[PDB]
Symmetry: D3
Subunit: 166 residues, 6 copies
Amino acid sequence: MKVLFLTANEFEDVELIYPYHRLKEEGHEVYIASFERGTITGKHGYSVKVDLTFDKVNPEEFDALVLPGGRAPERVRLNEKAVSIARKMFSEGKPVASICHGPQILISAGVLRGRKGTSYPGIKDDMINAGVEWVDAEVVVDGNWVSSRVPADLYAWMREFVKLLK
Amino acid sequence: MKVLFLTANEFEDVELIYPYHRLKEEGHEVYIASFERGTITGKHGYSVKVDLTFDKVNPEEFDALVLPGGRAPERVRLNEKAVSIARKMFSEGKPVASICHGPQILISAGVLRGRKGTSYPGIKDDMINAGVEWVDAEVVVDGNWVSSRVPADLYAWMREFVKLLK
Amino acid sequence: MKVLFLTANEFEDVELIYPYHRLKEEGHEVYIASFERGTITGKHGYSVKVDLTFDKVNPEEFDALVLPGGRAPERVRLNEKAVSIARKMFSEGKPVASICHGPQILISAGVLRGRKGTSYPGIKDDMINAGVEWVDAEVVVDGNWVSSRVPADLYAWMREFVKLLK
Amino acid sequence: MKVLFLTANEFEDVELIYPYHRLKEEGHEVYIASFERGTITGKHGYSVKVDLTFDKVNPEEFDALVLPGGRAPERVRLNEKAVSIARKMFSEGKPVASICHGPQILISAGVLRGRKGTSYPGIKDDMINAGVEWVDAEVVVDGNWVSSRVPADLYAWMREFVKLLK
Amino acid sequence: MKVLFLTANEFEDVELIYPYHRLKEEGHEVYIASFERGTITGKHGYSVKVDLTFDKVNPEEFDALVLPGGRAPERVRLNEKAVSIARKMFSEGKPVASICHGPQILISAGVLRGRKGTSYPGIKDDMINAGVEWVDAEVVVDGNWVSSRVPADLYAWMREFVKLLK
Amino acid sequence: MKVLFLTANEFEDVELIYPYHRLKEEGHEVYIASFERGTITGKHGYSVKVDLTFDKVNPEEFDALVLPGGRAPERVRLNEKAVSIARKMFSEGKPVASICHGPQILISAGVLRGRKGTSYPGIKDDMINAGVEWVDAEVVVDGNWVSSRVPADLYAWMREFVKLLK
């Protein structure tokens, strides 16, 4: 299965790298999409290469979506193309994994009303204002949406997402 | 007039330091409140001393509120006392100045429903979801609430807030 | 009134940003001059755009001068044009505001002989050797020359300078 | 199964965090052992808590071993107790996973003569001089020893190690 | 011969470390004096241990003095005890080596009028105002005073100072 | 005498800068060779200019070799040309000075069997596996090979190497 990542500079390093490798282990093809070609750098200094830009992404060519946290979501959520990618994939019922600030992108896509999930505790009120029934758990599974809160939840986060992709 | 600042570590340096000195110039007494006594450090390294903790703050003792941006608001908005301080002061109609991520505290206080203002563009969707008519202006004045977006707006931000306190 | 700033990379961030916005608030036009066009970065990481180079600066076109501190003055004071700009404006009796290491430029301009002011305490001996009656005060006003010591003096610094420009 | 990690300050962040969560996903208990109690910080800034010190480790109480890379191995390999732990566990046939500089600890344990595996290419000559049949592959499996080279190999590294612990 | 170093946090790393070892090579005993016991850290991150505090130093117990550059001199020159140490040793005709900002300490000691030397070009005007006939050379030898400008002058700087100590 | 330095990015700053100036003091010509032209930066941030690339180096055109430590050796030792340069110069009996991780390049050159010397203690086992009679001393002299362990050994390191070039 082809998994797409929507991220940018200042992403939370492990929230991108962990799922990237965890999914590759299963045989899934992983792709990193961002504003421009070249590379992006995490808040901790890890550098990763961008596979394609938001503009070149066709939501229909991917089967799953992963939204890492960090400061990147606040910039990504202002990009019409990136938000539409997430809106389409999420609404189509495709698997979507989010952690930390990653769901800010889904908030902006306007697809979370009535959904159940979690996020970085610091933005729980924004998730709630978007219609999310917020849960304080290491991992929440709501249909196609698997969400976690912080790096400490990584193990549980992909444990559930991997199952969904099987 | 006694002005209270609700902030913490990782505050946007100039968004705290600028209004602090600008108001001090007018003769106003400025107080920095945070989680604990001692000092706090901004995103850029500037250090400032804390005057009193959130718990020791009595809203009735202060006449105006300033909410600097940065990453601090996302931690401060999780403190019940800090949020109650903002809710009370804002509700009483006391002058409240916010910039960047600062209004995330007002979102959590539940006082922005039906109000008009601005903020860091990255969280405009969260402001909208809280009931704010979001304006893309360097400074917005809605009754007692004076709001701005980024450091580039500093001059207009305090220009309007100072008038409110006159 | 048109205010000129002589600075460069490694300027003390708030000593540049504070007066820039404070004066802009009053309606004054503020211009940043440095070695080359583009942008310069302060000791703490803040970035600001350069309006014009020292070479393109015509002293007769500006009404006031601001000299921020940091490590920048020690590089700026070695630029003949920059020093001549300061010498002319100061000599003409135009308002000149300096803080921290900023007056090192005035020392090099040779205009402080017999004047009274202050600066970062670390260079008081250099100010004295240049003929300055050094005062340990948050702000000193000597005719057209308004001087301060450290970031903690910002409020008093511009409070007096603004009056001079009124 | 109880998995022990031998590491210290300046460990390669993801080479410790990735296996830590990947193994926890399977239900294995993971323990971080280092020089002293408290916390240790990776080269990229991630902080992890130390569960026990080398001195308090009883090799017989753990079932598997993980050796992350970074600069930590060159310090850990100088601690006779830490090296004795690795020698004991490795020679007993217990599963041992190494990556990057991690195997420097095994070189010092004197248990690699005649074995096959890999490591950070920069120290391949040292692995060879220690009797290793060095292979340039993302992952090598030689009995109880699963080895990899760099962070890009993470997915294959744990893919194989997990199979060993099953 | 016993050589004393007057420095503090933020010293230019190589301007302290180079002469320290270069003189030890000759068999001279080297001592690091600063504000407090423990260690100090250079601007580049090198950490060195303090042998004794300024207060515990007896100028008569040392035969030569070295003044590294960096930001440390601006803090050291405000310490009455440190300045008196330099004033006494320099006036007694003992060998004194200075580089970069190091001579700011001698300026404050008030012993440079009429002397010939150099320093970081950025403070040449302050050296001149102190009565120094400033020379732009990698190394200047004026009796007991050997001075240089920047790290690039290190080889020439100690080449001359070593001769003086022979 | 013409002294060649084999190094690269992340070299231990003082282990390159110290011998560079100490040797220049004697009148020796020093040349920095690395992967590409331009500049290289030490682990602590010091920048030095590259005089020539490994590819353009003719071992016969240089009389002595210096191998600084840091992380650079582990990358340099993977460059077949750089390693061939060290092998040639070392086996020809030309003076060679190494410190810290510097000798990893000599291990890869295959010229240390039966030789006596030292290095960063962290890689002593690798030096031993390469046939070295490892000695724990600030400086070791074995014919044309002068070796040291850490920055604290600098004074003794060059004291002995200088004697060799005399």
